[PDB]
């Protein structure tokens, strides 16, 4: 499948795996119809994938600016600059 | 050689594996990764100025 | 070794060996000046480019003397033998390289690379030189030397040393191949004067049946093994014929069949 | 005036899907409806056009007999075939057939092929296929194969060979030269035109059938546009009338396509609408208007299931999917939808016979995927299946058994099996060139829609197309003739400019504008300026579109100069094609890829960096690394043999991993990743070919070796560490795995027999096949012979002997190999060349001579590697040792010309000598003024080394005047090797010495009876060494030869080639007679500038002060030498390609000066003159080579015999060859010397024989195709020096240009032997037998010591002391040289005693025998005398004596060129005496045929008569020697037969 079809299938799986209201007996009949009904191990892997997938008016709104970012010919990022 | 190798690394020099060459070289290789280098690169021929500092 | 991800780092370190050959230096100290090893620049660059940063390479130096100059020994042949190299020594075979182009030349010793800069003579290399001098009657101790190419950062430091007869007798009776064996003396080897030669170009001897780099197929490299020589150019360390197990290991059509393209 | 424009903004962003029209014209009852989630737009079956009162389907009886054989089995024709029957069979004009797919588009091409074959009648045979060629441009490979099969099945009665141009360049050239009908791709045809493989067969190609031009807006757009522009330029410049038949679909704006293809709008234009199709199909477009891709795919699957259920049992279904596995997945989904909705019984009706046939086909099938639906109504036909399964699926679909056959576009484009109802599901393809899932092309949609509705069984088709809602408009435009074809040539315009600059079509900005104006892009910009980005004011200010074409040419020149492909100057606009641009044009590489290959390729690059450099080309600039295939790349990174330095997210490392997986045959997982890997391999093949060409041009040996190894791994699809038998398809994979499991080399298997190789690999059954594969693998033996000629360069002869069984199924017609000789470092390729060993020249040692340079740091050994260009792991390495090489010493500096005053005419003493040169020149040359002090004021031996044109004849005349002033009764002898130069010297002395000084000036002939009288009565005898050798052999008896006063030897620098040892032997005999007759003769040796002049001065007795050996750059006329290297392996292709650069150099170097063109052969001179006339008439300078008028040439043209020569001389281009008349050649020389003509095409044999001096000398293809060895031998240095010195104008021109156009391998030797002085090398060791016989017969060499003393007085003893290795010696010492001289004397004595020519008393005393005296008297060789003594019996006849005289050693020097075997085979059937087993390559059979033609007075050609005259010049001496051998043996009747044969 192409990239847009794979993204749409991933969005459909994310919408049908998390918003199914914890229903596992009825979600397999739709996932097997959308995938082609290979085996139960694919549905068991998809269930685990769905489980692992999911200046204001305040005076203090502006945080106090305490002196920091210590300046120094030392490269904190630790990368030899080459401009 | 390290800079030539890291040019193709799509990033700046490692500056960590180069620590094997720390505190070496007549030029400031230990300071080759210093922050003020861009500021220091503008100065040219400071040796004569440092010498004439005796008159300064 | 690990042999899982360090091989790619070793290949990436060996791919930048052309920049390390431009900075050649020799240790100008402890010279006795009592023949001088005149190494050619092309064979030295070929030996430095075909070597590795961690795996040690080995090569026998053969050459004849210049006319009306007995105090110089110009190298003209770098014979490569099928052998493996560790981080401290090389497992060179006992069979000497025999060829027709090296019959008129004399063996001036051997050359090897080291990953660390050694300020003194190595005991394992001196023991291997003493064993090669004792196992071959044509390898006299007064003419055969040991060249050590220390892998400098961004360079390569060449140091040539001739073995003492007392040091050769100590190395021939030695059996421990550790880092510091018994009878290790600093007077066992004397650093001889070595120079480079830009006005002369030498050759090299490569094996015909197999390759010279046995770092991958170390089980097929034996000390009592025999191999022939050839007057061709030697291959690289990470060549296709040097590691036959890494190439012939894969197993033996419904894509976009674009036929008759612009080719 | 030039402006840099944006070449990327004017191009089309969509490409093949670019719709030029905004609205689409729809029919009346073609409404649409949006039912649920998708909009279905229907278009019904359109009614066909009614036939007129005088228009009907013409049957086969109206076709002529030339076209009736091609239309076999067809009673009548179609509507479009009968409406344009007179335009494709009776008219040879350019036709433009705009017919839809399925309307009989192949019938017009068959009629055009029958009309092209109708021009060659051949009433005696069947057809003349060797006089015409028909090219068929097909966009698809399977469609090209189907067209080639249809042309082979239809034209089988006419003998038209239909073949597909594929393979390498040499294989495509052999297929074009061996066949007449060539069906190929437009891109492959453009690559063959850019490489030069079709230039030799361009005149025979008179039929260009460009089929399927509807892809003119597709990716094949600019390639076909450049091909049409090149065809228009060849038709306008070379005036070659080629019938162009362009077939396109029903598309608007066909007038611009007819004007671009040079087709007439009235007679050539045939615009057929959609009603002209025989099967009107209903067009359904189901555009998905949904936003979710999964819901759109579900709606498309539901629409496909509804379309399958609507036409299950009514008609057959043809499903069209994108991929091979996708078609099987769609078929399985359709079968599941039929089984779930109970629709499987509709397609599977009561068809129990067809059901049993389908069940038997399912039980007989081997594919598990095709057998899953084969009992059902579905079927699959993919490209990944077997050929037998695809044939069974096609037979089931054609017999109305398969209800729903799912196939790809390749089955619809290659197999002509149309179905009733078709459904193209998805309309989307993943392109790796675009790197994304885009829409389908127009040509693929036209091929898929053309298969809907069978013309035989069906009456109305039904074509459904599942696509998107946005793409439904343009799909309505291409299916209803509403999509105009827009030219997208702006994208590949710098590539087309580089191809035109490499092919020689465009050189300047005006030529580039003229080439761009004849293409379809200029017609599209003129017809539609808004579609090409041109405003109204730009069209108003430029109606001819010249400013936009000039801006595009300037942008292409800037893109070529920025990419370093071609040198383009902005001042003059001229473009010079470089090596990188030629390598990009010959391999179809882009400009950015060429710039990356020029800026990235390093000589110290390893094998790891080469893959990253090849993956960073411009062909993979749009290829992106997908995140879904990152796991496959990570799995393949640990299995590839070559590591990748880049990260996994980089496209270059992904392309390198894909190339490593395709090389090592690794199994992939993704289909899009596999398609990207296949496209990357298809680009990387040409990329590695271009990288190997650039590395061979740069000289990096290791980079070229790595590129050749990568090209062999890409071609053979195997790694370099694999077995050599893996490339052969006849070997099993298990035996290859067993051979690769055992660590054994391939060289050890060649030494084993069929049983030992079977017992070593534990497979005795496959041992004989392994032995046959080892004997069939290419492995030749190379022998190197080195000879140091100079101190800086040496001659290397490589003898290649094929030690393998040549076969047509393994090696083919010829095997190509690359031979590279380099130093010990293996980094600088010193000499790279190619060798094409043919099957006719196989199993024979071929000798190739090359020049290898040598510097002061000499290596101990060089490496000569001969690798195979196609076979992997097939390379032979030869170490040529230079340790024991005896190199010569340093050459001495030449005698520099002093800056003194020029001597006037009053410097001479005699007034009669000054009267003959007063009107010629008032002052002599400075070299002549320096040599007059040693020639006129002295009498010693003077060696004058001067180039041709420095005035050596003035020094010879001064020496002759000094010899005449010293003695009035002197006897001067001037020996010259060339007979024409000796005749010119005699003609000069007849006017200078005989007319002004009244001296007896004569020329020696080939008659010994008059030669003594001419020597005794003549004072200035001009002679040849072959003529003076008869008089010098009897110098002791003849008192006139011993009493000589002056011995001039002209052109001694040719003493190491032809007539080389004869002149050296004559000089040695003169030096021996000068020191033994008590009279030192004044020896004047005038020759060219030689480096080893001291040895020539010591061998001739010349002093150190009389050696006037000048420099080659010390000539009075400065010579500018240019070398044009052409990288062409074939000699005929190089001679055809070097015609236009020769005319360009003649136009750029000397516009208003005479020029001499040195041709390779006699028949090639007229072709070169015709090519120069065509190049002059193609430009605006018509007849510019004629500086005079026709009234002055009308008395000159009336004396010529050849009408073509007079027609060429009427335009100002004269010709001169060996076949022409001497009076016509003298008239042409008088016309060229007076300034009437500007070009004189002279043959290679007329280089020394040319009494004229021009300003420019263009020597084209300095080689000779010898048929005795069947090889292209290089030109000698003496002829090249004479051709360089022939352009020496002292007063007519200020300088002299010398342009030598040759191969790239011979450019370095021709550049080294031009400025540097060429040393002389005596080759007398190969022809010392005749000199030894002449010394023994004259009682000179009576023993071994006298023979050694006679051999030491020659030039060979002086050359052996300076060059020992050139004379095969092992040292310069006295003992080694004495041993070599004793061995040579012993070999000469053994050759004289074995041939019964001499007698050896006590093995040392040499005595002349009768046969040796007869050979030395009549100037015959020892081998010919031995053959006459051993072949003539006492019962011989005239027929045996003629064959004995024809087989002599003097007849071995007959010229054998191309196209001479057929004339000899035709003349052998009319000779009075037959030849037992005649050989077409042997010179003895040709000499016997010439003698039989001269004895019977039969007619022959000029090239045969020129050899018959040279045969009859020595046949009298051969008959005299045969009569002497018959009289000495005591035979009366063979002597009488020989006398009668001589009298006849």
Chains that touch A (3 or more CB pairs under 8 A): B, D
E-strand stretches of D485-574: 566-568
For residue D816, give the H/E element and its range.
Answer: strand D814-822
Give contacts of B20 with chain C, Cβ < 8 Å: 153
Alpha helices in D364-456 (DSSP H): 387-398, 409-414, 442-449
Q: Is D333 exposed, middle or buried (0-12, 13-18, 19+ CB in 10 A)?
A: middle
Please name the residue of chain B whose CA is at the shortest distance from the CA of residue D609.
B8
CA–CA separation, D1124 and D1129 (whole Å): 15
The contact set of B with C (CB < 8 A) is 1, 4-5, 20-21
Of residues D293, D430, D628, nearest to A8 (C-beta): D293
Is D274 in contact with D455 (CB distance < 8 Å)?
Answer: no
Q: What is the full DSSP assignment across D657-671?
A: HHHHHHHTT-----H
CA–CA separation, D1538 and D1526 (whole Å): 8
Annotated ligand binding at D106? The verdict is yes
E-strand stretches of D215-323: 243-248, 269-271, 281-288, 317-320
Q: Are strands D205-210 and D1398-1401 parallel, antiparallel or unpaired?
A: unpaired
Of the candidates D963, D957, D1017, which has an alpha carbon nearest to the alpha carbon of residue D992? D957
Chains that touch C (3 or more CB pairs under 8 A): B, D
CA–CA separation, D1544 and D1539 (whole Å): 9
Q: Are strands D461-468 and D421-425 parallel, antiparallel or unpaired?
A: parallel
- Nearby residues of C2 by Cβ (< 8 Å), 6 or more positions away: none
Chain breaks in chain B (C to N over 2.5 A) after: none
**Nearest chain B Cα distance for residue D652, angstroms:** 12
Give contacts of B31 with chain A, Cβ < 8 Å: 73
Q: At what angle do helices D579-586 and D671-698 cross, to 10 degrees?
A: 140
Annotated ligand binding at D578? The verdict is no
D23-48: buried (b, 16+ CB within 10 Å) or exposed (e) per residue? ebeeeeeeeeeeeebbeebbbebbee
Alpha helices in D1318-1401 (DSSP H): 1329-1337, 1344-1352, 1355-1360, 1374-1394
C199-224: buried (b, 16+ CB within 10 Å) or exposed (e) per residue? ebbbbbbbbeebbbbbbbbeeebeee
Chains that touch D (3 or more CB pairs under 8 A): A, B, C
Annotated ligand binding at D53? The verdict is no
Which of C 44-83 lie inside 8 A of D, CB atoms? 46, 76
Which of C 141-180 lie inside 8 A of D, CB atoms? none
Is C206 in contact with C80 (CB distance < 8 Å)?
Answer: yes
The contact set of A with B (CB < 8 A) is 71-75, 78-83
Are C247 and D588 within 8 A, CB to CB?
no
- Nearby residues of D654 by Cβ (< 8 Å), 6 or more positions away: D623, D625, D633, D648
D643 Cβ under 8 Å from any chain B Cβ: no
Strand, helix or coil at B29?
Answer: coil
Is C245 in contact with C217 (CB distance < 8 Å)?
Answer: yes
Is D560 in contact with D595 (CB distance < 8 Å)?
Answer: no
D646 Cβ under 8 Å from any chain B Cβ: yes
Longest dimension (CA), chain D: 128
Is D1487 in contact with D1497 (CB distance < 8 Å)?
Answer: no
Is D704 in contact with D826 (CB distance < 8 Å)?
Answer: no
Of residues D641, D856, D861, nearest to C231 (C-beta): D861
Please report, for residues B23, B24, B32, D593, D1253, the alpha-carbon distance to residue B27 in angstroms, rounded to integers and kept in the order given. 10, 8, 8, 40, 70
Please report, for residues D662, D837, D869, the alpha-carbon distance to residue D488 in angstroms, rounded to integers and kept in the order given. 33, 43, 36
Rounded to the nearest angstrom, the gap between the alpha carbon of residue D729 and the centroid of all alpha carbons in its chain is 30
CA–CA separation, D102 and D748 (whole Å): 60
Handedness of CA C69, C73, C76, C77 (dihedral sign): positive
CA–CA separation, D799 and D850 (whole Å): 11
CA–CA separation, D715 and D727 (whole Å): 9
Give contacts of B5 with chain C, Cβ < 8 Å: 12, 16
Q: And the tokens for D1313?
A: 């032997």
Give contacts of D142 with chain C, Cβ < 8 Å: 259
Q: Which of C153, C154, C155, C156 best probes binding to B when mutated, by most B CB atoms within 10 angstroms?
A: C153
Of the candidates C83, C142, C72, which has an alpha carbon nearest to the alpha carbon of residue C112? C83
C100 Cβ under 8 Å from any chain D Cβ: no
Chains that touch B (3 or more CB pairs under 8 A): A, C, D
**Experimental approach:** cryo-EM
Q: Count interface pairs B-C at CB distance under 8 A.
A: 10
Are B4 and C16 within 8 A, CB to CB?
yes
Annotated ligand binding at D100? The verdict is yes
D647 Cβ under 8 Å from any chain B Cβ: yes
Are B12 and A81 within 8 A, CB to CB?
yes
Of the candidates D848, D813, D852, D844, which has an alpha carbon nearest to the alpha carbon of residue D834? D848
**Nearest chain D Cα distance for residue A16, angstroms:** 13
Rounded to the nearest angstrom, the gap between the alpha carbon of residue D1324 and the centroid of all alpha carbons in its chain is 37
Are C20 and B1 within 8 A, CB to CB?
yes
Phi, psi dihedral angles at D1274 (to 5 degrees)? -75, 160
Are B1 and C12 within 8 A, CB to CB?
no
C25 Cβ under 8 Å from any chain D Cβ: no
Please report, for residues D239, D240, D827, D1211, D1484, the alpha-carbon distance to residue D1174 in angstroms, rounded to integers and kept in the order given. 9, 11, 45, 11, 40
**Nearest chain D Cα distance for residue B28, angstroms:** 30
Q: And the tokens for D1129?
A: 């392996």
Annotated ligand binding at D371? The verdict is no
Header resolution in angstroms: 5.8
CA–CA separation, D225 and D216 (whole Å): 8
Annotated ligand binding at D860? The verdict is no
Of the candidates D125, D105, D340, D309, which has an alpha carbon nearest to the alpha carbon of residue D209? D105
CA–CA separation, D1138 and D1261 (whole Å): 8
**Nearest chain B Cα distance for residue D647, angstroms:** 8
Is C64 in contact with C191 (CB distance < 8 Å)?
Answer: no
Is D868 in contact with D876 (CB distance < 8 Å)?
Answer: no
Q: And the tokens for D567?
A: 């040198």
A and B adjacent (3 or more CB pairs under 8 angstroms): yes
Q: Are strands D875-881 and D1405-1408 parallel, antiparallel or unpaired?
A: unpaired
Tally Cβ neighbours within 10 Å of residue D270.
22
Of residues B16, B31, B32, nearest to A78 (C-beta): B16
E-strand stretches of D1194-1326: 1213-1216, 1239-1242, 1256-1260, 1263-1266, 1271-1274, 1296-1303
CA–CA separation, D372 and D118 (whole Å): 53
- Count of all residues that appear for chain D in the document: 1544
Q: And the tokens for D98?
A: 């705009």
Q: Count interface pairs B-D at CB distance under 8 A.
A: 4
C230 Cβ under 8 Å from any chain D Cβ: yes
D1452 Cβ under 8 Å from any chain B Cβ: no
- Tokens 């800079």 belong to B3
């Amino acid at each position: 499948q192409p990239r847009d079809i794979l993204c749409g299938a991933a969005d459909e799986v994310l919408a049908v795996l998390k918003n199914e209201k914890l229903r596992d007996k009825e979600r397999r009949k739709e996932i097997d119809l959308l995938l082609g009904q290979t085996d139960d191990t694919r549905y068991h892997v998809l269930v685990n994938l769905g489980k692992k997938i999911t200046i204001d008016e305040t005076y203090g709104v502006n945080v106090q600016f305490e002196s920091d970012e210590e300046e120094g010919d030392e490269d904190v990022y630790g990368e030899v600059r080459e401009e | 050689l390290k800079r030539q190798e890291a040019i193709a690394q799509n990033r700046r020099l490692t500056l960590e594996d180069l620590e094997d060459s720390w505190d070496r070289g007549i030029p400031r290789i230990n300071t080759l990764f210093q922050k003020d280098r861009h500021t220091l690169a503008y100065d040219k021929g400071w040796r004569v100025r440092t010498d004439f500092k005796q008159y300064q | 070794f690990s042999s899982k991800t360090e091989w790619r780092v070793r290949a990436i370190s060996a791919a930048n060996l052309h920049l390390r050959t431009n900075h050649i230096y020799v240790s100008s100290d402890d010279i006795k000046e009592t023949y001088t090893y005149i190494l050619p620049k092309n064979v030295l660059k070929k030996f430095i480019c075909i070597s590795d940063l961690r795996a040690q390479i080995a090569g026998y130096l053969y050459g004849v003397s210049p006319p009306d100059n007995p105090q110089v020994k110009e190298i003209r042949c770098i014979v490569m033998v099928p052998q493996w190299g560790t981080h401290q020594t090389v497992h060179l075979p006992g069979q000497l390289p025999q060829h027709e182009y090296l019959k008129e030349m004399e063996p001036l010793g051997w050359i090897h690379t080291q990953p660390n800069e050694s300020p003194q003579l190595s005991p394992q290399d001196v023991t291997t030189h003493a064993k090669i001098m004792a196992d071959n009657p044509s390898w006299d101790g007064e003419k055969t030397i040991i060249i050590t190419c220390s892998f400098t950062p961004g360079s390569c430091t060449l140091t040539a040393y001739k073995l003492t007869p007392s040091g050769y007798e100590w190395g021939r009776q030695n059996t421990d191949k550790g880092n510091n064996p018994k009878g290790y003396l600093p007077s066992h080897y004397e650093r001889v004067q070595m120079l480079l030669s830009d006005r002369f170009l030498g050759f090299f001897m490569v094996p015909a049946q197999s390759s010279w780099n046995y770092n991958f197929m170390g089980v097929r490299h034996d000390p009592n093994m025999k191999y022939e020589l050839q007057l061709a150019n030697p291959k690289e360390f990470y060549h296709e014929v040097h590691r036959p197990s890494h190439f012939l290991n894969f197993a033996l059509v419904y894509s976009a069949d674009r036929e008759d393209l612009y080719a | 005036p030039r402006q840099v424009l944006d070449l990327e903004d004017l191009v089309f962003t969509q490409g093949s899907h670019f719709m030029a029209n905004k609205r689409c014209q729809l029919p009346d009852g073609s409404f649409r409806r949006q039912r649920k989630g998708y909009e279905e737009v229907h278009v019904p079956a359109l009614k066909p056009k009614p036939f007129g009162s005088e228009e009907q389907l013409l049957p086969v009886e109206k076709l002529p007999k030339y076209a009736q054989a091609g239309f076999e089995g067809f009673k009548t024709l179609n509507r479009i075939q009968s409406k344009l029957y007179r335009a494709a069979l009776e008219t040879d004009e350019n036709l433009l057939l705009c017919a839809p797919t399925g309307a009989g588009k192949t019938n017009v091409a068959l009629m055009c092929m029958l009309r092209e074959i109708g021009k060659h009648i051949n009433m005696d045979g069947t057809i003349n296929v060797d006089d015409f060629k028909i090219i068929y441009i097909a966009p698809m490979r399977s469609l090209v194969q189907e067209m080639v099969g249809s042309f082979g099945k239809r034209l089988a009665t006419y003998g038209i060979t239909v073949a597909e141009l594929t393979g390498d360049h040499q294989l495509c050239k052999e297929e074009i030269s061996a066949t007449q009908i060539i069906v190929c791709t437009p891109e492959k045809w453009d690559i063959i035109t850019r490489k030069g493989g079709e230039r030799t067969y361009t005149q025979l190609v008179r039929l260009i059938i460009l089929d399927e031009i509807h892809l003119l807006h597709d990716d094949r757009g600019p390639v076909l546009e450049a091909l049409v522009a090149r065809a228009i330029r060849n038709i306008e410049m070379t005036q070659e009338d080629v019938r162009l038949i362009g077939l396109s679909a029903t598309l608007p704006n066909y007038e611009d396509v007819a004007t671009f293809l040079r087709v007439d709008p009235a007679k050539g234009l045939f615009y057929f609408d959609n009603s002209f199709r025989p099967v009107p199909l209903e067009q359904t477009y189901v555009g998905i208007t949904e936003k979710k891709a999964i819901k759109r795919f579900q709606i498309m699957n539901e629409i496909v299931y509804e379309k399958i259920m609507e036409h299950a049992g009514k008609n057959q279904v043809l499903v069209f999917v994108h991929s091979r596995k996708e078609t099987g997945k769609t078929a399985r989904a359709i079968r599941d939808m039929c089984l779930e909705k109970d629709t499987l019984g509709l397609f599977l009706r009561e068809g129990s016979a067809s059901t049993e046939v389908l069940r038997t086909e399912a039980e007989q099938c081997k594919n598990l995927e095709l057998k899953d639906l084969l009992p059902y109504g579905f079927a699959i036909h993919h490209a990944g299946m077997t050929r037998v399964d695809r044939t069974l699926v096609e037979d089931l679909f054609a017999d109305k058994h398969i209800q729903v056959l799912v196939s790809t576009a390749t089955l619809a484009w290659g197999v002509n099996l149309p179905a009733h109802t078709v459904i193209i599901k998805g309309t989307q393809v993943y392109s790796p060139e675009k790197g994304r899932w885009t829409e389908l092309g127009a040509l693929d949609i036209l091929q898929m829609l053309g298969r809907a509705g069978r013309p035989q069984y069906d009456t109305k088709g039904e074509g459904i197309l599942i696509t998107s809602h946005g793409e439904l408009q343009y799909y309505l435009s291409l299916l209803n003739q509403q999509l105009p074809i827009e030219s997208q040539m702006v994208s590949k315009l710098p590539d087309m400019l580089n191809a035109e600059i490499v092919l020689g079509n465009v050189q300047n900005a005006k030529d580039a504008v003229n080439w761009l104006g004849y293409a379809y892009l200029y017609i599209r910009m003129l017809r539609s300026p808004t579609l090409y980005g041109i405003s109204h004011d730009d069209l108003k200010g430029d109606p001819l579109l010249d400013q936009r074409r000039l801006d595009l040419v300037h942008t292409a020149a800037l893109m070529l100069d920025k990419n370093n492909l071609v040198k383009y100057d902005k001042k003059t606009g001229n473009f010079q094609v470089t090596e990188l641009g030629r390598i990009a044009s010959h391999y179809y590489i882009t400009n950015d890829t060429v710039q990356t290959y020029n800026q990235l390729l390093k000589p110290t690059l390893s094998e790891i960096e080469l893959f990253r450099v090849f993956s960073l080309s411009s062909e993979f600039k749009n290829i992106t690394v997908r995140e879904e295939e990152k796991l496959e790349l990570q799995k393949l990174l640990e299995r590839v043999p070559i590591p990748v330095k880049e990260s996994i997210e980089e496209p270059s490392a992904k392309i390198n991993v894909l190339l490593q997986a395709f090389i090592s045959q690794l199994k992939l997982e993704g289909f899009a990743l596999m398609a990207d890997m296949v496209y990357v391999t298809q680009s990387a093949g040409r990329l590695m070919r271009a990288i190997f060409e650039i590395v061979l041009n740069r000289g990096w040996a290791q980079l070229t070796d790595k590129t050749l190894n990568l090209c062999k791994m890409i071609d053979k699809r195997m790694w370099q560490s694999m077995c050599p038998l893996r490339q052969f398809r006849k070997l099993p994979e298990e035996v290859v795995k067993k051979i690769e499991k055992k660590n054994f080399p391939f060289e050890r298997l060649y030494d084993l027999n069929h049983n030992e190789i079977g017992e070593l690999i534990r497979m005795p059954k496959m041992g004989k096949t392994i032995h046959k594969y080892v004997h069939l693998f290419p492995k030749l033996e190379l022998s190197v012979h080195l000879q140091p000629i100079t101190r800086s360069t040496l001659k290397v002869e490589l003898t290649i002997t094929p030690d393998f069984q040549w076969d047509e199924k393994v090696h083919g017609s010829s095997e190509a190999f690359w031979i590279l000789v380099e130093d010990v470092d293996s980094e600088v390729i010193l000499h790279h060349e190619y060798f094409l060993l043919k099957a006719k020249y196989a199993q024979d040692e071929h000798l190739i001579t090359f020049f290898v340079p040598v510097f002061e740091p000499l290596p101990p050994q060089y490496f000569i590697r001969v690798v195979s260009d196609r076979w992997l792991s097939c390379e032979t390495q030869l170490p040529v040792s230079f340790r024991h090489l005896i190199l010569p010493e340093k050459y001495p500096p030449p005698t520099e010309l002093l800056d003194l005053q020029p001597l006037p005419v009053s410097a001479l003493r005699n007034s009669a000598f000054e009267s003959l040169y007063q009107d010629k020149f008032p002052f002599f040359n400075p070299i002549q003024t320096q040599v007059f002090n040693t020639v006129y004021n002295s009498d010693d031996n003077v060696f004058v080394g001067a180039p041709t044109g420095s005035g050596k004849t003035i020094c010879a005349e001064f020496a002759i005047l000094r010899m005449l002033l010293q003695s009035s009764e002197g006897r001067c002898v001037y020996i010259t090797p060339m007979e024409a130069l000796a005749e010119q010297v005699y003609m000069d002395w007849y006017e200078k010495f005989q007319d002004r000084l009244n001296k007896k000036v004569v020329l020696l002939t080939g008659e010994t009876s008059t030669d003594l009288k001419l020597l005794g009565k003549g004072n200035i005898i001009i002679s040849t060494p072959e003529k003076w050798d008869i008089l010098s052999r009897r110098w002791k008896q003849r008192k006139n030869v011993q009493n000589i006063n002056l011995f001039v030897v002209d052109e001694v620098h040719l003493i190491g080639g032809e007539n080389g040892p004869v002149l050296e032997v004559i000089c040695s005999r003169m030096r021996y007679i000068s020191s033994q007759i008590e009279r030192p003769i004044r020896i004047v040796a005038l020759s060219s500038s030689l480096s080893n002049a001291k040895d020539v001065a010591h061998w001739l007795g010349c002093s150190a002060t009389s050696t006037f050996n000048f420099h080659p750059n010390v000539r009075p006329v400065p010579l500018e030498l240019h070398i044009q290297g052409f990288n062409i392996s074939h000699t005929q292709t190089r001679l055809l390609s070097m015609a236009k650069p020769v005319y360009h150099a003649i136009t750029k170097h000397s516009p208003k000066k005479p020029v001499i063109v040195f041709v390779p052969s006699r028949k090639q001179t007229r072709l070169t003159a015709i090519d120069i006339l065509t190049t002059c008439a193609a430009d605006i300078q018509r007849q510019r080579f004629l500086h005079c008028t026709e009234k002055d040439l009308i008395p000159y043209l009336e004396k010529l015999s050849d009408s073509t020569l007079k027609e060429t001389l009427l335009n100002g281009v004269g010709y001169l060859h060996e076949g022409l008349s001497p009076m016509e050649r003298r008239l042409v020389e008088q016309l060229f010397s007076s300034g009437a003509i500007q070009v004189v095409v002279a043959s290679r044999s007329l280089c020394w024989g040319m009494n004229v001096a021009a300003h420019l000398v263009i020597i084209m293809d300095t080689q000779y195709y010898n048929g005795k060895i069947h090889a292209y031998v290089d030109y000698p240095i003496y002829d090249v020096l004479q051709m360089v010195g022939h352009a020496n104008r002292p007063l007519q021109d200020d300088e002299g240009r010398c342009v030598i156009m040759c191969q790239g391998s011979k450019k370095d030797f021709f550049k080294k032997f031009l400025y540097e002085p060429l040393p002389v090398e005596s080759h007398l060791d190969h022809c010392m037998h005749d000199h030894f016989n002449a010394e023994i017969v004259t009682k000179t060499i009576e023993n071994k010591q006298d023979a050694v003393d006679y051999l030491t007085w020659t030039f060979l003893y002086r050359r052996m002391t300076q060059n020992p290795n050139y004379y095969n010696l092992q040292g310069i010492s006295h003992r080694h040289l004495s041993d070599h001289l004793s061995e040579l004397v012993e070999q000469t004595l053994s050759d004289l005693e074995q041939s019964k020519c001499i007698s050896i008393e006590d093995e040392m005393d040499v005595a002349p025998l009768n046969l040796g005296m007869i050979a030395a008297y009549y100037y015959i060789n020892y081998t010919t005398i031995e053959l006459f003594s051993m072949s003539l019996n006492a019962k011989t006849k005239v027929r045996g004596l003629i064959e004995i005289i024809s087989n002599a050693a003097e007849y071995e020097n007959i010229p054998i060129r191309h196209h001479e075997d057929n004339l000899l085979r035709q003349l052998a059937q009319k000779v009075p005496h037959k030849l037992n087993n005649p050989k077409f390559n042997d010179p003895h059979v040709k000499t016997n045929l010439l003698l039989q033609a001269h004895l019977s007075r039969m007619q022959l050609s000029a090239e045969l008569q020129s050899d018959t005259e040279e045969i009859l010049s020595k046949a009298i001496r051969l008959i005299q020697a045969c009569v002497d051998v018959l009289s000495s043996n005591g035979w009366l009747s063979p002597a009488l037969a020989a006398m009668e044969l001589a009298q006849m």
